[PDB]
Write an enzyme that holds these catalytic residues in place. Structure first.
Site, PDB file in Angstrom:
ATOM      1  N   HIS A 101       0.937  -1.395  -0.067  1.00 31.33           N
ATOM      2  CA  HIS A 101      -0.040  -0.234  -0.440  1.00 31.33           C
ATOM      3  C   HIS A 101       0.951   0.928   0.071  1.00 31.33           C
ATOM      4  O   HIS A 101       0.602   1.945   0.595  1.00 31.33           O
ATOM      5  CB  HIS A 101      -0.819   0.349   0.592  1.00 31.33           C
ATOM      6  CG  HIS A 101      -2.122  -0.929   1.205  1.00 31.33           C
ATOM      7  ND1 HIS A 101      -3.246  -0.732   2.120  1.00 31.33           N
ATOM      8  CD2 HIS A 101      -2.818  -1.779   0.452  1.00 31.33           C
ATOM      9  CE1 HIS A 101      -4.225  -2.222   1.763  1.00 31.33           C
ATOM     10  NE2 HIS A 101      -3.675  -2.918   0.553  1.00 31.33           N
TER      11      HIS A 101
ATOM     12  N   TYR B 181       0.038  -8.187   4.944  1.00 29.61           N
ATOM     13  CA  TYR B 181      -0.454  -9.111   2.642  1.00 29.61           C
ATOM     14  C   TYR B 181       1.098 -10.093   2.586  1.00 29.61           C
ATOM     15  O   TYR B 181       0.652 -10.477   1.764  1.00 29.61           O
ATOM     16  CB  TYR B 181      -0.081  -7.616   2.266  1.00 29.61           C
ATOM     17  CG  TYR B 181      -1.291  -6.536   1.996  1.00 29.61           C
ATOM     18  CD1 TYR B 181      -2.005  -6.972   1.011  1.00 29.61           C
ATOM     19  CD2 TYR B 181      -2.247  -6.172   2.993  1.00 29.61           C
ATOM     20  CE1 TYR B 181      -3.289  -6.024   0.667  1.00 29.61           C
ATOM     21  CE2 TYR B 181      -2.767  -5.145   3.293  1.00 29.61           C
ATOM     22  CZ  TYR B 181      -4.153  -4.997   2.303  1.00 29.61           C
ATOM     23  OH  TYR B 181      -4.635  -4.561   2.027  1.00 29.61           O
TER      24      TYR B 181
END
Length: 721
Positions: A229, A238
């Site tokens: 991100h 993630y």
């Protein structure tokens, strides 16, 4: 059928593993029973509609993309059981029909090519397409090839490019890391289902991008950091998706006509050793690496850790020789050190359960307590420390001009404002500390270790980067390191030179140049520890028992505070280099997960917390204390006498602590003046230092956090080494 219907078989063995089911297997029968109950609930609550508006009332509002994925996942659960010989639904005519009539209906008025993303893109391109792929894969013997192609073009419409996501929107983005791995579980399987070769190769080639280490942007870094991100530390969420999903895909990919080179996948071991392992303490995945997932009730530290562990295990299984054995031992020792969480509670397929069982029962696989280590993830402004001798972990959560402090998106993590403002984590004998509702009950205005004003904060706020780049850690070895953060709060009304000196079995916290230009009160939270009603603490101030109340109590001229447990591995002592004025309280704190995450339960949760803080009413204020864990009272009292003169300096330009026993110095310089330390040597450059004296020799570890570079010894140290 063909090779596609060969790879899909292997895929089915990985995502369900019905072929490995054994009803006499305790753990397996448990998961089977869970799936039986899920399908029963679905089949019974499903609208036996003459074409009603929805399939499930719980997931009625199809405006909320989450309801699409949640709907399709229910059908995947049915596909798993219908193909499980031991399930009451094995080859059940009604279940087979339901899954079909349900695909047609959703495909008719809800999820199709002629539709557009409504709400979250993730559900339209990742969540739903994965569920559809898996359902068709498991029940490919009941579906028509043309039927399969039919229910899958919608995925080709929303996800036609293996290199980009949100393609059908007015702002697509290049797929990297976790999202890119999901691109494989979406397009590689869909490609096998539609027997599309171009789709397979193109997607595999794109996935290979994941094995490249980066020095900027999103991905894995050489120092172990993982960014996602744009600029958020995200190894624990993630990164999880990445290793979890990739470990599932690899066995299938390597059997296709587009296998991945063995040298390319070599990087995986780097992630495991440098990125993941350091963040796992006693079976818990450090929250400072999980971003907004800390606000999810079903994903607390120990649960999230299993996503990583099962991924590492799968990788070990496909590896060989010592690589396999060493990864097996890593997984084994971590799981066995976790006395709090039952790893099997998060192994959701029979092959994963089977793998773990043989590993735990294999005497040939070594399970030895992990050794001490210290990881300076400078690329994501986080530091992880672990002491194997005394048995405690320490996590330092920071941010800088290079990273976002906290992620608040999709209505998740509404109060993580200060989780990176010099917040610290202590992992001790209480493996449940940051679990059992810690996040929805912790006071968000008093995150441990942080210096802030008491101004009210808004849930609608989002993260920000720090004005300064002077944030970083200088590591000398596996047990000693020094860190600093040129801190400025969210609205530029308060500043502080915050520094940490990790010295093997303790960590010194130093703060100077504390200034406040607002009308709000400033204070530093020394700690906010969640308590166990079973293991009560006996609190001592200046070595005299003190009774904490819900109401704050002031303790001026405090030289020390000691939290005494029946278990020494849960003891926590704080030694104040200079007598300080602090306040303490012990109170029950209530809250609900919904408070910090809109999509969570509003059910009330409560925990008892012991809060320690030091107010800063004047400009130029400071704080300084040593955190000493896992030692008994008498030992703590002996240590502070040893540390009597450990504080070398704590002002606006220089901060340093000295460990005489170790012969180690931790030093932070904010300017380039010549600093004479202990009348033994001189440090000459702005930056962070960790130095050790071995005889007449000096081992130097210097780090310039702004340029992210070290420097030749002669440039920063004098009195060559």
């Amino acid at each position: 059928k063909d090779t596609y219907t060969d790879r899909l078989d292997d895929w089915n063995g990985i995502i369900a593993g019905n072929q490995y089911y054994d009803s006499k297997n305790d753990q397996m029968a448990k998961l089977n029973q869970e799936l039986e109950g899920k399908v029963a609930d679905s089949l019974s609550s499903i609208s036996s509609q003459a074409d009603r508006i929805y399939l499930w009332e719980k997931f009625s509002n199809y405006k909320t993309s989450a309801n699409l994925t949640a709907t399709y996942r229910k059908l995947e659960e049915m596909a798993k059981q219908v193909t499980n010989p031991s399930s009451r639904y094995y080859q059940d005519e009604t279940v087979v029909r339901t899954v079909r009539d349900s695909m047609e209906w959703m495909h008719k008025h809800v999820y199709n090519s002629e539709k557009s993303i409504v709400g979250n893109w993730w559900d339209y391109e990742i969540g739903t397409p994965r569920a559809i792929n898996n359902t068709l894969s498991l029940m490919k013997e009941y579906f028509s090839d043309e039927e399969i192609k039919k229910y899958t073009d919608v995925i080709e419409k929303f996800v036609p490019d293996p290199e980009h996501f949100r393609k059908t929107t007015d702002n697509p983005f290049k797929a990297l890391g976790g999202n890119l791995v999901d691109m494989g579980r979406v397009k590689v399987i869909a490609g096998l289902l539609r027997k599309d070769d171009q789709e397979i190769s193109s997607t595999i080639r794109s996935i290979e991008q994941v094995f490249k280490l980066v020095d900027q942007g999103e991905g894995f870094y050489q120092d172990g950091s993982y960014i996602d991100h744009t600029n958020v530390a995200y190894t624990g969420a993630y990164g999880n998706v990445l290793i979890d999903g990739l470990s599932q895909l690899l066995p299938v990919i390597q059997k296709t006509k587009n296998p991945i080179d063995k040298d390319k996948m070599q990087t995986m071991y780097h992630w495991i050793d440098k990125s993941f392992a350091p963040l796992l303490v006693n079976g818990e995945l450090m929250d400072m690496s999980r971003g907004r997932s800390i606000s999810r009730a079903n994903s607390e530290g120990h649960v999230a850790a299993v996503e990583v562990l099962r991924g590492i295990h799968r990788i070990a299984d496909m590896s060989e020789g010592e690589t396999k054995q060493r990864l097996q031992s890593l997984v084994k020792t971590i799981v066995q050190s976790d006395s709090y969480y039952d790893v099997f509670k998060n192994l959701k397929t029979y092959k994963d359960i089977s793998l773990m069982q043989s590993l735990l029962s294999d005497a040939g696989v070594a399970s030895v307590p992990r050794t001490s280590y210290l990881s300076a993830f400078n690329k994501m402004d986080k530091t992880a420390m672990y002491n194997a001798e005394k048995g405690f972990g320490f996590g330092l959560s920071l941010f800088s001009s290079r990273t976002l402090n906290y992620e608040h998106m999709n209505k998740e993590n509404k109060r993580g404002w200060y989780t990176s403002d010099g917040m610290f984590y202590l992992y001790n004998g209480d493996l449940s500390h940051y679990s059992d509702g810690y996040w929805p009950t912790v006071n968000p205005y008093k995150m441990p270790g942080t210096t802030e004003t008491d101004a009210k904060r808004a849930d609608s706020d989002t993260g920000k980067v720090l004005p300064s780049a002077f944030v970083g850690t200088s590591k000398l070895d596996d047990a000693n390191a020094t860190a600093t953060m040129d801190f400025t709060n969210w609205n530029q009304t308060l500043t502080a030179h915050k520094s940490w000196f990790m010295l093997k079995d303790k960590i010194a916290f130093l703060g100077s140049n504390i200034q406040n230009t607002s009308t709000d009160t400033a204070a530093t939270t020394i700690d906010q520890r969640k308590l166990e009603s079973s293991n009560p603490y006996k609190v001592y101030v200046n070595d005299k028992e003190a009774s904490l109340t819900e109401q704050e109590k002031d303790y001026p001229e405090t030289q020390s505070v000691f939290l005494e447990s029946s278990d020494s591995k849960k003891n926590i002592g704080y030694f104040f280099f200079k007598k300080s004025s602090i306040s303490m309280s012990k109170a029950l704190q209530k809250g609900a997960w919904k408070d910090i995450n809109e999509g969570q339960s509003d059910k009330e949760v409560e925990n008892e917390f012991l809060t320690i803080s030091q107010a800063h009413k004047q400009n130029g204020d400071s704080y300084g204390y040593m955190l000493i864990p896992n030692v008994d009272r008498a030992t703590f009292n002996q240590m502070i006498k040893e540390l009597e003169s450990s504080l070398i300096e704590n002002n606006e330009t220089l901060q340093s602590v000295y460990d005489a026993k170790q012969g180690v110095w931790g030093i932070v310089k904010y300017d380039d003046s010549v600093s004479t330390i202990s009348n033994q040597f001189q440090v000459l450059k702005r930056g962070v230092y960790t130095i050790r004296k071995e005889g007449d020799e000096y081992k130097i570890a210097y780090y310039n956090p702004e340029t992210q570079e070290s420097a030749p010894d002669q440039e920063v140290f004098k009195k060559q080494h």
